[PDB]
Structure 1
């Protein structure tokens, strides 16, 4: 329904340890000298 209490600064931050994003995996082109994704296309 509702909270009873002010969520602190701490558990607010502990609640967010897994809010990240895993960086993409990249690969330099075959002789075009720049990165792009794996099993994707370069554009």
Structure 2
């Protein structure tokens, strides 16, 4: 229940390949321009689907 050997740098990195972050699904705010998540609200425009809250 313990490592029989110490893990090398190479395998450490090979494991940490997939350990990463994809970017968001991004879109502009057509109202005031800046970027935004898809299907979500522009925090700065305060707008969504051509409608302000």
**Structure 2 alignment gaps of length 5 or more:** 44-53
Q: Which runs of 5+ in 1 are unaligned?
A: none
Give RMSD over aligned pairs: 0.8
Distance (Å, rounded) in 2 between the aligned partners of 1:35 and 1:28: 4
Alignment deviations for residues 6-27 of structure 1 (CA, whole Å, 9 cap, x no partner): 1001000001110011100111
Task: For CA contacts below 8 A with separation 6 or more, give which structure has more relative contact order.
Answer: 1
- Compare the two structures and name the one with the higher strand fraction: 2
Stretches (4+) displaced over 4 A: none
The TM-score normalised by the length of structure 2 is 0.74
Give me the TM-score of the superposition, normalised by structure 1.
Answer: 0.88
Classify the secondary structure of the residue corresponding to 1:13. Answer: helix
